[model samples]
Target: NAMVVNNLTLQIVQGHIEWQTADVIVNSVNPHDITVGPVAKSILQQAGVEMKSEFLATKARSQLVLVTKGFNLFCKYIYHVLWHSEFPKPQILKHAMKECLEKCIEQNITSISFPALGTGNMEIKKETAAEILFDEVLTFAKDHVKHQLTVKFVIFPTDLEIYKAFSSEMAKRSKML
Candidate 1:
């Protein structure tokens, strides 16, 4: 969907968050902050976040946890966000995104990046995932007017199809765009 900010248009996507080349890269991580699975592995490998099976085992069932260290990458920092896996429900996803965004804003980050979250492995439908993310982003943008943070939704080619579907739905929702 397209959201107008300072007259610039923003299009949301359903893909990986790695495309963010900003000061920080937001990762959909587990509570313990260890690198595992597709999204985690990709970000870990790319950012050089150390992988440890033991460390990840500690918090297997927590949410919104942050891992401040252990990742070595070009970005100034990596915000590890533990999002809910359930799909079709927007509350948890909304909370996770808000927490991550608030953290970034608190850090004074001008830009932040995120992946398609919950769309992978979580079995959440693509359309629902896009709507959930878009809703939270829109709320965040509206709530935090003082901090002008630029958010980018990075999607892979396969995920891009889902994003296209989301865009179509969004277009249908608004006539101005």
Candidate 2:
């Protein structure tokens, strides 16, 4: 799904978001980078010590929020969001994206990438979450044009099925448009 819509380059991948070369990459940080979970752990490792201090310093510890830094990660910046949910509540994912996208627009971040929120260890239904994710991205892409924005979904090999579904959905959405 590597196509341009409303100037946002939407992409899907069967890989990790950490490797993306965008202006910012999002970390699905739930409980903070306490060296737990592969995703958060890996991010904290690459981000170095100061990253943890800065992350722990964030005020919005348990809500739909984002904190950013240009740490040692390959990307210029990293946007960390808390994806913890009660269960099956995908609206949290929308809020997650809303904050991230809103921050991106505020910072004039031209390109931003994120993995599937509320999936995997968080255990939200994968397909449904992808749908909601695409919905939010598509909606944002269409409604906001104040500045150029690009969104990418970086999927790890842990879920090839999600990668495939997002691919199909992206194509379907593009065709429908």
Candidate 3:
């Protein structure tokens, strides 16, 4: 766990993201990067075929977002983001976070859950991913005020190191700011 900063709270939970309750759950994936994780599999199955088309269409448009209304799932929305897997991952992450918040604010949903983006199949270093996630999230938290927002960030059940990386980054970055 990381200390609360403003309305932001860092939760290093070890579980399937699909099980977490939120107005939205973040997917660290491209339309092509879908189906690699368990949560992705669950989300893909439950979201049905139209959702898959939406996923690809959103990715094709380079907006890097696909908002699928959760069907027979824990969360009400899934914000599928194309977690960039290259140098300057932070740049893409920042935009994705921004767009996601804009969409949610427009739709009036406040709380969200995020996974440790681009950490697994994308092979980005845990620390690098952490730095990007914390920076973008902290920025989003500080600047956002149209609604009182809450965020939960998670790692898979066995991915303790990833959680540690994210929490430590948040702790250090929060202090710096």
Give the Cα lDDT of each candidate: 0.63, 0.76, 0.72
Top lDDT prediction, candidate number: 2
Per-residue alpha-carbon lDDT of model 2 for 37-127, expressed as tens digits? Answer: 6677767777788888777776443556656675887777778777554633577777888788888788889888888777766467777
lDDT of 2 at 157: 87
lDDT of 3 by residue, 1-177 (tens): 656667656566777776778889887664556876756776677666666666666554465677777665677888888654553665676678778877767777777888777676656688987787777666766776435677777788788788777768766776785
Clashes of 1: 2
* Evaluation by TM-score, superior candidate among 2 and 3: 2
Across residues 54-173, which tens digit of lDDT does each residue of candidate 1 receive? 235435554564545334544666767665455333566677777887786778877766777667774667778777776776666667777777776666667556668667655754
Segments in model 1 whose C-alpha atoms lie over 4 Å from true places: 1-3, 7-9, 12-16, 49-63, 67-72, 84-89, 169-177
RMSD of 3: 2.9
